[PDB]
Design a binder for this molecule. Sequence first.
Ligand SMILES: CCOC(=O)CCN(C(=O)c1ccc2c(c1)nc(CNc1ccc(C(=N)N)cc1)n2C)c1ccccn1
Lengths: 27, 10, 252
Amino acid sequence: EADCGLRPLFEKKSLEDKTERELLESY
Amino acid sequence: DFEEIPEEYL
Amino acid sequence: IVEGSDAEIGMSPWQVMLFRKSPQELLCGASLISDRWVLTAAHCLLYPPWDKNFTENDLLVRIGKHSRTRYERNIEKISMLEKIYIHPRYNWRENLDRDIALMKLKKPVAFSDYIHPVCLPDRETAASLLQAGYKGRVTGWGNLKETGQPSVLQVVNLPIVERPVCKDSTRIRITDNMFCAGYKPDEGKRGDACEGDSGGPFVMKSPFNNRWYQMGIVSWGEGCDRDGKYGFYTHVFRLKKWIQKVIDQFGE
Ligand SMILES: CCOC(=O)CCN(C(=O)c1ccc2c(c1)nc(CNc1ccc(C(=N)N)cc1)n2C)c1ccccn1
C-alpha cells in the first residue's frame, strides 16, 4: 500500500502517541 | 461477556 | 497483554479481532494489511493438539475496535471470510515453524480513522530494524495475567532478544522463521503477549520514513510474562514471498 503504516489520528496529523518515542529511542 | 452483534453478519 | 497499557484511540488502526460466531468469543488478534486481507497466525485456524480447525464460515473479523466486548457501533466494521490460506509448510506438529495465514474478506473494508492497514516489511526494512535490543510493539485484547480479560485494547513495547538467548530459554528447536522478544529478568521492565493475543501483530516504526511495519506475529509462548521466558513471533519478512504469491494469485 502507499498509505500503509501512516495512522490517521497520529502520523497523518503529525501527532505522536504516548509511547512511540520509547521505540525510536531503542534504535 | 460479549455484546450481541447485528444478526446481519450471520 | 501482561504488563501492558491501555491503547489510545486509533493507536493501532490495523488491529483486527478474530471472532468466533458461536459461541461468540475472541479467538486471536490479527492485522489489516490491505482492504481485503487480514494477516494472523496459522495456529488460530489450525492446531490439532488444542482441537482447532476452523473454516471461513466459522469466523467473523472485527476491525476498528478498541473496546474488548462492546459492539462499537459506527466505529468498528465486521467482515466475513471468503477464503483462508495457511502456509503449505507450517509445522504445527513440531515447533509452529511458518506460523502464518491470510484471510481474504468477503468484501473490502473501508478505511477510516480507526481502520487503516500496516505495511509489510521488505529485505532492507527487516535488515535495519530486526536487531536485538530494538523495541517493537505488541497489542491485544487477551489475558492480562497468565492465570483477567482487559476492557480495552492493550499495548506493550518489548525489545527483540538475541537468537542465542531465545534458544537458551526453551527446549524447542527455534528456526530462522522466528524471533523472540521480551525483557530479561535483570532488565527491570517486563511484559508479554498472552492467551487471546496470539495471531496479533508485532510492529515497529521505521525511523527512516515514519511508517509502522509488522515484523512479527504473536506465535507461541510458555505461560505469560515469566522470568526467563520469551514471546516467540513468526518472522514476517522471511515468509513475505509466500504472502506475495498468495495475494497476487487469488488476491485483490
Ligand atoms: C517444554 C515446555 O516449554 C516449551 O518448550 C514450549 C512448548 N510449547 C508450547 O508451550 C506451546 C505450544 C503451542 C502454542 C503455544 C505454546 N502458545 C500458543 C499460542 N498462544 C500464545 C500464548 C502466549 C504467548 C506468549 N506469552 N508470548 C504467545 C502465544 N500455541 C498455539 C510449544 C512451543 C512451540 C511449538 C510447540 N509447542
